[PDB]
Design a protein around this ligand. Sequence first.
Ligand SMILES: NCCCC[C@H](NC(=O)[C@@H]1Cc2ccccc2CN1C(=O)CCC(=O)c1ccccc1)C(=O)NCC(c1ccccc1)c1ccccc1
Length: 290
Amino acid sequence: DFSLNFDRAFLPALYSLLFLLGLLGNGAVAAVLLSRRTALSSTDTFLLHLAVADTLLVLTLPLWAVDAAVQWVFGSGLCKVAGALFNINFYAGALLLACISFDRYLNIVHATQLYRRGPPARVTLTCLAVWGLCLLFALPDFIFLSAHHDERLNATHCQYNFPQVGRTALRVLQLVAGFLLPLLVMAYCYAHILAVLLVSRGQRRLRAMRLVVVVVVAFALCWTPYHLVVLVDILMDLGALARNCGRESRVDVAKSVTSGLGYMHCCLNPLLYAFVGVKFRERMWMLLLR
Ligand SMILES: NCCCC[C@H](NC(=O)[C@@H]1Cc2ccccc2CN1C(=O)CCC(=O)c1ccccc1)C(=O)NCC(c1ccccc1)c1ccccc1
């Protein structure tokens, strides 16, 4: 019962603070961006969509906190709705970070082949593609997610009724599409950005390099701890390890803590991609004056 009590005494407050801070940060980013009368640049649009995704993901948190505390008490319909929202927004966030990195790489590395004389380079096509792909990936949540009434704990939670092979397949898709592909795209793009910036000439390059390194390190540190534990759980399930109660409890608590840390990244997104740029701070100041 150690894992259950730890969840009870630790998830409510953490998710409450995440909810407050995410609603106050990503909402502020969204408002600052939507306050713009003129056009919005490519990275501005991607940041807007990222802010919306993070807002929804944090919005669904308190229901999950209640789930951890006592039990699901909203029926299966809200189980399905919340799960779909969660997965859609998580995948959207990952792919939007990858798209932001690719846009930065295109603008800085291939700087002389994409030059434009101050037009709006509309990028809504990729945003629609991202959202459609996220819906396609979340379909299984729409299909399977239900609220089983456990006869072992007498509880009632939002869990999948997949077959075991299905659970492993969904875990593998999570790992591949949410972590590995975004991480590789980010790594390539930002390594090339650094390679270009080290051989550039200016005084603004230093902050750019530091920001790039911080962004990559933040993503890696925040998300690796959870995906590594997910890989350990896959290894256990496929027979690569021996099951026991103590290991089960360790895995459960580790998953809880690592997931908390991971959603802390969607909490921190405003502090890295939005508030550090002079453009966004100027827009924020203008808005607050208004
Ligand atoms: N043993 C019971 C809990 C097993 C799931 C595990 N729950 C947690 O750890 C914490 C703490 C915790 C404690 C005890 C009971 C419940 C929870 C809920 N948690 C949450 O925050 C929400 C998760 C959730 O109910 C959910 C999310 C999406 C769709 C449907 C449901 C977890 O793995 N959650 C994050 C994970 C994931 C969730 C569901 C299915 C597959 C994976 C994830 C999803 C997307 C991106 C990254 C990670």
